[PDB]
Amino acid sequence: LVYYEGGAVCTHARSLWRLEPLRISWSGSHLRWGQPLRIRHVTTGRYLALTEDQGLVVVDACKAHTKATSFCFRVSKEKLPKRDVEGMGPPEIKYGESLCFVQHVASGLWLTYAAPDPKALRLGVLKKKAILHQEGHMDDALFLTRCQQEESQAARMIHSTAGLYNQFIKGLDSFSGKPRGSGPPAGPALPIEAVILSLQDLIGYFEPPSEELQHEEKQSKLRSLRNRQSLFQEEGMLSLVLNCIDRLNVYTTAAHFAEYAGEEAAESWKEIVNLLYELLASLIRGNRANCALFSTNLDWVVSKLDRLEASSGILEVLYCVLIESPEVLNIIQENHIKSIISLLDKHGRNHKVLDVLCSLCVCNGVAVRSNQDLITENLLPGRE
Amino acid sequence: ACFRMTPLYNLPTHRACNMFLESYKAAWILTEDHSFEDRMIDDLSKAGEKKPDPLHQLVLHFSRTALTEKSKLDEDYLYMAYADIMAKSCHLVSFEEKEMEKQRLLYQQSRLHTRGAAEMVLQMISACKGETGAMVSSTLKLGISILNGGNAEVQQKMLDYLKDKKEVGFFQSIQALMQTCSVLDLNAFERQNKAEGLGMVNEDGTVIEKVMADDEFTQDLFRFLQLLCEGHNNDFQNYLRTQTGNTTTINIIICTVDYLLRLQESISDFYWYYSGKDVIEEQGKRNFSKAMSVAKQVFNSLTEYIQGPCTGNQQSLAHSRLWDAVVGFLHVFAHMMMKLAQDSSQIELLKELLDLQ
Amino acid sequence: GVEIETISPGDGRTFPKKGQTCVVHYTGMLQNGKKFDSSRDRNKPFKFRIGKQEVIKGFEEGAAQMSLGQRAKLTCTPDVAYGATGHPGVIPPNATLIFDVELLNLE
Amino acid sequence: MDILELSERLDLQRFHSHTLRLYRAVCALGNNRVAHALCSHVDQAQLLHALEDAHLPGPLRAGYYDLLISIHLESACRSRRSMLSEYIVPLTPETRAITLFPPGRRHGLPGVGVTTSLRPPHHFSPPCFVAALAPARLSPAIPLEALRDKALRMLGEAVRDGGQHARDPVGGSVEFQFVPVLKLVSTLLVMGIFGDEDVKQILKMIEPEVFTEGLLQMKLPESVKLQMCNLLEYFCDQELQHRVESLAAFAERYVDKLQANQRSRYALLMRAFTMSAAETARRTREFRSPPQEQINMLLHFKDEADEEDCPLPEDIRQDLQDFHQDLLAHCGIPQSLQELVSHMVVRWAQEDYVQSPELVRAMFSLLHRQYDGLGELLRALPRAYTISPSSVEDTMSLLECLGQIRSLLIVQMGPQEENLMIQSIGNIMNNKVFYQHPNLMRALGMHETVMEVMVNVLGIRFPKMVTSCCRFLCYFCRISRQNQRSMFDHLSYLLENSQGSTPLDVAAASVIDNNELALALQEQDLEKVVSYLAGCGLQSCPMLLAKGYPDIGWNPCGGERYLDFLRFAVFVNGESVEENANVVVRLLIRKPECFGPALRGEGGSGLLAAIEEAIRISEDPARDGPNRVHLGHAIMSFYAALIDLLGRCAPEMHLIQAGKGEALRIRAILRSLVPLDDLVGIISLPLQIPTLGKDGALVQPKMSASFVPDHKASMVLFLDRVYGIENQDFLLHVLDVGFLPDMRAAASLDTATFSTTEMALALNRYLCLAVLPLITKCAP
């Protein structure tokens, strides 16, 4: 469902659109008003379309049949279309300012906002629903703004990553029960290698800037990194990683994953789990918002503190969340601190656990008194 | 109070000591003059055995304070003092005499120019993010001191940095400041003065908030803008109404005209509220005086924008509604002075109004 | 209750009483062997007056049985000790305390 | 294993270093209750031994030094630091003998001299764990004498031979050798422990040439540079304190003399005011001038062009001039600290590029202070109050309470902290100092510290904190006008955040009978207060009906609560602020629902009906519930305060003859607003009578249960304030039921048996305040 939303989505990834002519050659020519072009949402791979069910929905790729998805571009509302040219084309439309309408080619349906009076506008954000209209409001005009290369690259990466990981999740559910025993696990083969390579590429994509780098580019790079993490968050990549981790950690070890999905797949279960945890760490490391996003499911990470498969990764995730959010300190309870302490007596003498405990007490220069107490009365007196 | 008030004799020593100590301060310590900025900048400049000079290190630190991401810049008294030190360093009949003063000023501004003052000034201006704080009151003064006399090297460096950095916020911040600039506001003029009329100066009561406090601020911002243009650096005035490299584009000159229109409205309303009355109180007198002073500054700014033949700025004005403002000023001006001509005590006020026109 | 293990014999004629101030250099320990507090490390003797319950009841009774100049070793069971709560951060719950005390002077 | 073995067993080294870090973390920021536990685990012995051990590795040497500071010191260090930046100076006889330059004019050593600035002591508590089993646990004690001399001795052991150029460092690096010891010494200095001889040793060590191949001369890394920056900063602060105290001492002597000539001159005039009538009769003035102006005129001789202002003898003003020259000399206007700091800082800057930002900041802060001393004196003088010698212990109580208060803003607020702040506030109030010296509490930033606490809590849980804080702020308002103004600035916050007592009460108290502040009311603030009434015009608090309640549409509860603020904001000092009048009714009509469920417009109903609602549905308790409050009487309060606010917003009669079309149209708005007649209705809508007889019962109605007589009084006020009474007919009409029968009820209550009742008293006030004065007005 399309909406003329505003505010945040002026700087998010679902707001992007990608123009595409219906001519394969010279597609990059300058836009001429009324060339039968085709618009493709990038982060979802859907096409602005004219269907009978709703009038304006983003149909999937497989039904952009040159009628529902062909559009012109019109300077003004009046009636009248130029055949494409084998050259770069004399420029007509301009970024920034030059206004242009939207004109479907099938049924002359111009694109105006419905603007009815339901409770959706009053309760939620002012999101004027977008619909087609033969004429509609006479003030349905558009300013064209360019997107930076990092934004477009991140949008396409979101598209590919979401598709691949949803396929992987689909497979994981395809053998939810069903112990294969002897023989094949199921029909589809897990995109194991694609998952691993994509994970490593994304991990590279989010690496922090080098400390040794100067102070005038490191902050620009930090801003870019925070922005990219924000884009990936606001399109569900955190949720996709969380769901993959949930689907995998159900299996207590690689052997269980083999019993359900064959040995040839289980040979990399540990690696995939470690990569998933490290990616989830990178998505949140430093970004205040994404660390805040773990206010509720904190128990989640705590409940998984004692998995010997990927132990360092989950600890480092917890460390990042704790040091980049004060609110998650207030929600800490006794069972959480007890689990963190038990991590010491189960996995040995490791200093990072102590560092996590230190971060639990003081935040932003303010001391969380209850955490100090709980740590003192649950760790020190035993002296073991 | 008219019936009796204390001799200091009956005050116990504890109150008397305080009242002494808040009078010895203003009467004596404030009036004292210490000229240390020159020596501070003269010795911080020397580096005597690629290594940046000490003043350069200070400048880079203050720049870092701005480049680092902080939503609202926090009051740093250190910058708020060193900036004024630098400004005082920059600040201080024959053609040879004039040229000697000119050379001294050139060196004084250039020593800060080399070590990175222009960049930090612009960065801090951006960092204030449209807020009216003493931060800007100091940064603008420092920038003016650097640019006083139109040191073309400074204009080159600032334009170059603002171009290559392609920052889209500097002009947004300047626009925010400018649209937040005050205006004579005859309203509060009636209010408080009437209140003052009542005169609630009771026991230990204090007569004194001048209307439009932030007159010096506007007068300095507009002067800064003008000095950015002085010397007819047509390239800079060309960049002014259109960045052409930034993601967006803002015309600063039209915003300047907008503030001019606001001031035109305010003085016009002053004219009507005061029109019936014959002699304005001294408070209203210097209210109008400081109004014309800010006006003189804004008009010199406008002049500068188009002083050279920046035809682009000329057309931008040619569409602008400045015509009305001055049209208003026409009706605003000739009426004033006739009444001002009627007042013999307001001759100097008439002089100021005349030179404004 | 408390017990008196005469590590070294004191005087045996004089004993602490009501309204008198006793000074001690106590070094103390848990039952396993860990040590929690020692006056001797602090370097100052500890003072208290038999009667107003400065200390846990057990310590008071134990120091009351003692003589002057007699080192001993009290063994305060939890009930005459801190007890179920335990001193938070120092004494675990329901712990038995052993105290190498030495009644130095009785004033 | 021996601890020094943690120099090759690196994993245990790191683990133990982080264990010490965790110890400091749990004890951080005032947690003394945990500090005692750490005393048990790390003793007062181990600490001293680790401090005096050379073979210990770095991450453990620094670890143990910082552990010592955390367990024992940095809970009195932060508090003593917070109160270091203020300069209360008791006018003791001791403080009189303080001269900038010790007699003999060369600088005395910094920080070596009698300083009477009134810093409070810091309390400790022995740590024993045998005591029987909350009040604030003080920090664990430590012998602060062996520690002091020990720090000095090891600093000496680490300085010159430190520069022996030996590749023997104490702890693996020059940094790990110096940094901890300097940290400890600076902390001890700030605590005020070091005597004068010890301070002389410290100075001799820092720079032996000027203070009498030192410390600054030798080779140095950056962190150690930062530590010397802290030390020299402490000494600069001591010098500033000395200047301020010398100003206080000279103020004392010079004012004890400066009064003498005033009395002598008064005697001279009284003996000789005659013979010079209208000649000295102008000079006799300045004795009826207010005292601050008198003092300013007394101290007005420096410019030598204004010298006629001063009537002083020449010698007396010479005293001030000499003191001024001495002050300038002391302020600089090497062979001294100033030049040492300047040359040191410049040399550090010009011998290497400093990559430590905080080091750069420290360097240039010191440099600025050492080039401008007069300026820092002028910026510290605002914090300078000379209290009498008597009121000194009270100030200690005040300062310790303030220390606890501002020592809890660093800790998130639980129940224990809540109780501690509430006790501290009460202790602040009870000081007679709080009454006597309001300027001081404005100087210490008290109304800002408490405001900050309230902002933190409001930004709800812990409501009693907001109640206590707002009561404190109301008292601050009431104490004196300058406080009112002070907090009037925050009125935006104090209003946008709006239970017994409320921050809205603070906002109202800011402007109670202060024309200057009342007028200065920004319009948008008036909207903000009409919003939150617009914000409560059509609503019922879910926070009210959590128990069985009739759940009516509108909520007068918040309504009247906001209304009273406006009532204060419009009418002051027995007259209207007509300047802030059009704003009031204009803003009220822009939200034409605010006039109540009745008097909206279309759908509006009878005002007599508007109250008839309560007349019936309030008096039966069948609707309220199956005890906090009752209804109707609060509804009546709403429909009372509305009318009172509008009445107060009425133009005065002399302003009526001003022909103010503004005022006249406001009258018209009022007149169309409520009919001129309904008045007599609500005036005549009768209310119950006390339990006269009734078998000696108490069926006398509860006020919260029966009709607001002040509702009718407000009616009368509005009646005589805008509608007025102009014929004997309407006066007769009101007297018929609205006035005379009320008098019958009152004088029936006049019986000694049924006069003490609250209802009689309220009716007495009602008749006295509005009825009787009106009747007097219409008598001719």
Curated annotation (Swiss-Prot), chain B:
It comes from the Eukaryota. The N-terminus is blocked. Channel activity is modulated by phosphorylation. The modification S-nitrosocysteine is found at C2. It is found in: Sarcoplasmic reticulum membrane. Detected in skeletal muscle (at protein level). Fast- or slow-twitch skeletal muscle. Ca(2+) binds at E230, E304. Cytosolic calcium-activated calcium channel that mediates the release of Ca(2+) from the sarcoplasmic reticulum into the cytosol and thereby plays a key role in triggering muscle contraction following depolarization of T-tubules. Repeated very high-level exercise increases the open probability of the channel and leads to Ca(2+) leaking into the cytoplasm. Can also mediate the release of Ca(2+) from intracellular stores in neurons, and may thereby promote prolonged Ca(2+) signaling in the brain. Required for normal embryonic development of muscle fibers and skeletal muscle. Binding of [3H]ryanodine indicates that the heterozygous channel is activated by Ca(2+) concentrations 4-fold lower than normal. Single-cell analysis of cotransfected cells shows a significantly increased resting cytoplasmic Ca(2+) level and a significantly reduced luminal Ca(2+) level. The calcium release channel activity resides in the C-terminal region while the remaining part of the protein constitutes the 'foot' structure spanning the junctional gap between the sarcoplasmic reticulum (SR) and the T-tubule. Pore opening is mediated via the cytoplasmic calcium-binding domains that mediate a small rotation of the channel-forming transmembrane regions that then leads to channel opening. Belongs to the ryanodine receptor (TC 1.A.3.1) family. RYR1 subfamily. Homotetramer. Can also form heterotetramers with RYR2. Identified in a complex composed of RYR1, PDE4D, PKA, FKBP1A and protein phosphatase 1 (PP1). Repeated very high-level exercise decreases interaction with PDE4D and protein phosphatase 1 (PP1). Interacts with CALM; CALM with bound calcium inhibits the RYR1 channel activity. Interacts with S100A1. Interacts with FKBP1A; this stabilizes the closed conformation of the channel. Interacts with CACNA1S; interaction with CACNA1S is important for activation of the RYR1 channel. Interacts with CACNB1. This is Ryanodine receptor 1. It comes from Oryctolagus cuniculus (Rabbit). The chain holds residues 3634 to 4020 of 5037 of the full protein.
Curated annotation (Swiss-Prot), chain C:
Its EC number is 5.2.1.8. Coiled coil: none annotated. Detected in heart muscle (at protein level). Isoform 1 and isoform 2 are ubiquitous with highest levels in brain and thymus. It catalyses: [protein]-peptidylproline (omega=180) = [protein]-peptidylproline (omega=0). It is found in: Cytoplasm; Sarcoplasmic reticulum. Gene3D superfamilies: 3.10.50.40. The keyword GTP-binding does not apply. Residues 19-107 form the PPIase FKBP-type domain. GO terms for molecular function: calcium channel inhibitor activity; calcium channel regulator activity; FK506 binding; peptidyl-prolyl cis-trans isomerase activity; signaling receptor binding; transmembrane transporter binding. Its main location: cytoplasm. PROSITE patterns: FKBP_PPIASE. Inhibited by both FK506 and rapamycin. Keywords: Cytoplasm, Isomerase, Rotamase, Sarcoplasmic reticulum. One of its GO terms (biological process) is positive regulation of sequestering of calcium ion. PANTHER family: PEPTIDYL-PROLYL CIS-TRANS ISOMERASE, PEPTIDYL-PROLYL CIS-TRANS ISOMERASE FKBP1B. Has the potential to contribute to the immunosuppressive and toxic effects of FK506 and rapamycin. PPIases accelerate the folding of proteins. It catalyzes the cis-trans isomerization of proline imidic peptide bonds in oligopeptides. Belongs to the FKBP-type PPIase family. FKBP1 subfamily. This is Peptidyl-prolyl cis-trans isomerase FKBP1B. It comes from Homo sapiens.
